[PDB]
RNA sequence: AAAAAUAACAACAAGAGG
RNA sequence: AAAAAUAACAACAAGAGG
């Protein structure tokens, strides 16, 4: 796979990501964790995103593998 | 309870229409005000006796050269008041514009240059266009509410015309055309009278001549009920009577819960 | 599926109010009762279903700590 | 599935109208006549078959409860 | 025919205004929807049986911290949906929006800060203001129709007040207040409730606490029901009782021409 | 999948005007000449085939069944 | 897959210029060759992969008979 | 299956600038830095991933063919 | 005084249509039937006496003289 | 000189009247009497409308003048 | 002439509550004390003199007749 | 002519601060120094002069008798 | 008085005028011949303005009295 | 008529910066040219004519001497 | 296609920048508005027709101390309106503010009294703003689209400055002045010309008389455009050269995209 | 708290929420 | 074709017609 060491080496350096949705809207926080269908994403509140409706994860700085 | 009725069949001409039947059409539909739009007849041959509806006051502004423009309203009461143009050049002249006042109401009818006849016609058109939307800027202050019956041969959107694909060069389907009318409905806040009550595909509004564009219902909605935000809630009903036709357009027939008073 | 029961059956027993954001963008505020493999309840004033491949965010209305 | 089926059974055999809401916001008010793993009935004038990949919420007119 | 009554009666603390005999009035006033600004009470406070009046619901949103803000809502037939807050900070932390979505239409309770302690509450009023205007550019796209009972501790115009030359400068009727009421009901298209139908003067919903300003009638006008260019039509009788006043706000009582539904 | 089979084989074998309502809100109006899963085929003067993930109804025009 | 397999082959050996719409409606215009359980190919002055997850129809210009 | 993954490797060798289109319909130029089987990345300015399931088309600027 | 009334007459004879701006804004319209000193008087569908003290100007619809 | 008879002609028909002013006010009553420089009508108390603040005067029904 | 000097005395000499409305919509409440041909005096607070050339109405609160 | 020249006389005598109000709302304070049939000389920081036929009332702050 | 003859020199050598109504609203032409009460005005239409509703008289090109 | 045309006459001989408000509220800067029995003329750029019927005030930015 | 140039020059003299070349800069660098701030010359002095620029029309008001103040305007086409002065004695004594007013736009030079020679001088100055502050608030209502060209002796922000830790005590980095000038040109909402076309600094329009100042670069940022902000989006060009300088001053050169005209 | 449904935008580096 | 009426904007160089 990629997604799983791309979205722990996003975590656990506390990157800051922007995610757009499907609808086209944008999400920003740190990741908290993320499980086969969802990822728990971090800011104002502890907040559940669905991986069935993200379109992509932008970083805010260059992450590398 | 209280009801309204408001017609606005565009003719092409009150004289082909009425001796194609327009007039015992008309007196057998109940209707408060009639709108009717190209009349193409001057105001001193709608006054002979063959046009009056009984019933119905007859209030006529035609055009200059009698055969380019013209509009007449029928109205069951008698108006408050009954003025003609706009105000620019493009309207006061071909006789494009008419408006009967009522008590908190006022119905006006409206004609626009199709466009089709030459290019000539699209800078017309063009003209027309920006400034009725200078006069809708201007009437966005006011305290009345108004029913522009109009003729505005612009097809708003795709649910509005067959195979809409083939008609984005031809004029009534132009990009500023379509620009137009999502600036007067969608961001001007008035009202379109045919979209509140039903949203099916299939109505429309005009017809060219060929017998193959009319079987299999090749059409354009260029007839509109444009009406100001405080009585989009009024309307019960909105058909477009496709087969008793008596011209080239179909009559827009409208039932507001609107009491018209006097 | 690991960090998906947990949240959801915590949002279930706190009562914390949601807003449920569905793929379109509409907002269905309200109250997470129940929920299986595929669907939600939430009870605003009627108790409605909400699958979940309609679902694309569940934000809650004040903070929630998970083991 | 423990929580799918009950509910729209409930919904089913009392016949008490529904109105279920689709993916792009279209509402169909009827009854549930019967229903699949993938698949509901909507009765109304016609039955329709409301594949539930597009459906997106369900609100009954009066409430239920399993 | 049809009828629909709403009133929107700040309460200043609706315990302190229950011992005065709030409910007792609300319950003889035959109301179908009931709104109640600055509630000043939590969420357990509005489940004891002294607020529940018999044949309506009662839903509340209450603060973080329980003195400053708490907006409640009764209502004769259920909702379709009750959400609360505006979505940015200064509206939804503080129990200041309660929305009661019905039918066609749905009927909001909005509190507004007073800013009348001080800077601290004055430059709050403003964020207040300018992010409730960008909400209301967001509802200008929507299809439904809402009542904004609100209490916006903003006076309109020069005859919401008395003696208007010695008010420019004190909070509730500065240029930039006043100019936010004239863009939420002149660029926005919003009506108010109460001018619609009766331009009367001294119809006063607010007084401060001495006596000698209550009988000298000197007061202010801060309880409007802000309304969507929908619904301008619809109103028969806004109404601003003077005596039985359970703060030191006056109840807006406002008849409508509509039928409430699910 | 044990009650979408019969129902769109009655639809086929009377030959009825059906109208499948897309998930954008498109219908497309025709009939049916086969079924199958993740496929049904649209008749008309073309013959097209319609995925069964972006269908959200399918209706016949007059009652059947 | 008992029919969409023979139909898209029957497609694609007749040379058929064909016309693919998306999901969100983007009508592609082209001509399939190539085709899996997932993907299609498509032949135009570029030569695109189409998913099948955001395929509502394909379109063929006349009309194509079946084996 | 089987004509998936060679036409994505291929286009993953000679290093093209691609054009990703999501299914919202809009786009994303850039060189594919890395992809398996449901996540395709795309080395921009940044180093973003796109999932597949919101890819509506993937196309080259530029006419290669698979082997 | 003296340029006033040949220009009402000439008004009112042809039923000449006129739009006559009132001090306030106010775009009356119709038909002179008569004037006077201080009133004239003017039709569109009833008639109606318009005092000369709020009328700003009055703009024919047609050259004439 | 047609406002003297025709206000006259208002007042003994009595004929219910609608008094626009110069700043766009209406007024409708029915004229009692009048002088050169003001006039009294009465629609619920007796009220004296000066001519200077008159625009227009329009009868409700239709009027004939001698 | 003969039709304002006996209600403009009448509205003195029975000292009733008037309200006069001026040519911009003003209304001003008061009592009639003394008038000329040219100007009114009325009192509330302070005895003040308004022309009659910028009243529009003189409307009073209890119905009156001229003798 | 026989009343407003004594109760203009007795503001410009006693220089009552008075507030004299235009037709279109506009108000002005100052002191009345002189008048003739036409206009009145306002004094204030400076001295203007105020046609009649713009003025609608005219107030004085204190109350004065003729 | 003054009045008159400038009005009779802006009517000889026929000046582009702008007359400013007392609500504010500018007419532009040429003065074609006045009278003691109105003024009437031509460019396109000639137009009788009431002399009580104009506040000013603005010549473009200055004349000399 | 015993009093206005001394204090114009002040204002004329002097170049007095005087400016003249109108019944709407109009500020007209300027000086005077010459004046009649109705008409003020007023001296800027271009030459202005004022009806003394349209104007409310006549004030001087300086302060000059009375009648 | 559009121009609209308008520079202004801060010539501290027109007999002082009459000497190194004003005019054959003016004339060459075809300005539709050229305004004058510190003119220090009495009226008659600009009588003299060796002052007069070739094909353009002179206004100027002056001082009564004549070298204290007095500003002047060269237009191409006369004017609506010269209007000159705000109406009060700290502007109309010294002749600080002349205004042409044209239609759809107005062009006023502004000045204000420097505070440099001693701190009466910054407390005159602190008058005349406050008082300029009561002049925007009466102008905040009307429609003409305003543009002051004014010379107010302040730089706003940080940038504009270099070295600003010696000069926050030096007349025209003050910190009240500064914030308040932030409260005046922030809530009023009116902008500069300079800002719309470049966010960063490095640009200024003041320098003390000594090349000590001249090889080590202190800078003060000055002479604004005071833009009203329906003109906010339409600055189509800005300059600021420090090279061919007519005083202690630069000029600022400012083309907008419209058609000045009567 | 949502258009009983646009026979279909060769494609809005994306509307912290339509 | 017009707010049964703003106890009153020390003053919109002026809305081809509020």
Redesign the interface.
């Given at each position: 796979?990629?997604?799983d060491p791309?979205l722990n080496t996003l975590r656990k350096e506390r990157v800051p990501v922007s995610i757009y949705?499907?609808?086209?809207?944008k999400?920003q926080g740190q990741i908290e964790?993320?499980?086969?269908?969802?990822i728990?994403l971090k800011n104002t509140?502890?907040?559940?995103?669905?991986?069935?409706?993200?379109?992509?994860?932008?970083?805010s700085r260059?992450?590398?593998? | 309870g209280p009801a309204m009725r408001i017609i606005s069949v565009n003719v092409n001409g009150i004289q082909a229409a009425a001796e194609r039947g327009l007039l015992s059409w008309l007196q057998a539909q109940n209707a408060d005000v009639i709108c009717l739009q190209d009349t193409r007849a001057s105001a001193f041959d709608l006054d002979d006796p063959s046009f009056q509806l009984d019933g119905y006051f007859l209030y006529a502004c035609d055009a200059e050269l009698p055969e380019q423009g013209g509009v007449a309203l029928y109205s069951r009461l008698q108006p408050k008041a009954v003025i003609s143009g706009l105000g620019f050049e493009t309207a006061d002249r071909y006789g494009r514009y008419l408006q009967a006042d009522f008590d908190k109401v006022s119905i006006a009818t409206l004609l626009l240059p199709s466009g089709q006849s030459g290019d000539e016609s699209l800078n017309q058109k063009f003209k027309f266009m920006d400034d009725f939307t200078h006069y809708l800027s201007k009437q966005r202050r006011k305290r009345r509410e108004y029913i522009y019956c109009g003729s505005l041969y612009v097809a708003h959107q795709k649910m509005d015309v067959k195979n809409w694909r083939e008609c984005q060069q031809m004029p009534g389907f132009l990009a500023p055309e379509r620009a137009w009318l999502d600036e007067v409905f969608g961001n001007l806040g008035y009202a379109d009278a045919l979209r509140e009550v039903s949203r099916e595909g299939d109505q429309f509004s005009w017809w060219p001549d060929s017998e193959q564009a009319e079987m299999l219902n090749l059409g354009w909605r260029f007839d509109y009920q444009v009406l100001t935000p405080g009585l989009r809630r009024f309307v019960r009903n909105a058909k477009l009577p496709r087969q008793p036709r008596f011209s080239q357009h179909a009559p827009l027939i409208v039932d507001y819960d609107w009491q018209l008073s006097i």
């Open positions: 796979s990629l997604q791309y949705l499907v609808n086209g809207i999400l964790s993320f499980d086969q269908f969802v728990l509140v502890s907040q559940m995103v669905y991986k069935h409706a993200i379109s992509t994860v932008v970083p260059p992450v590398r593998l | -």
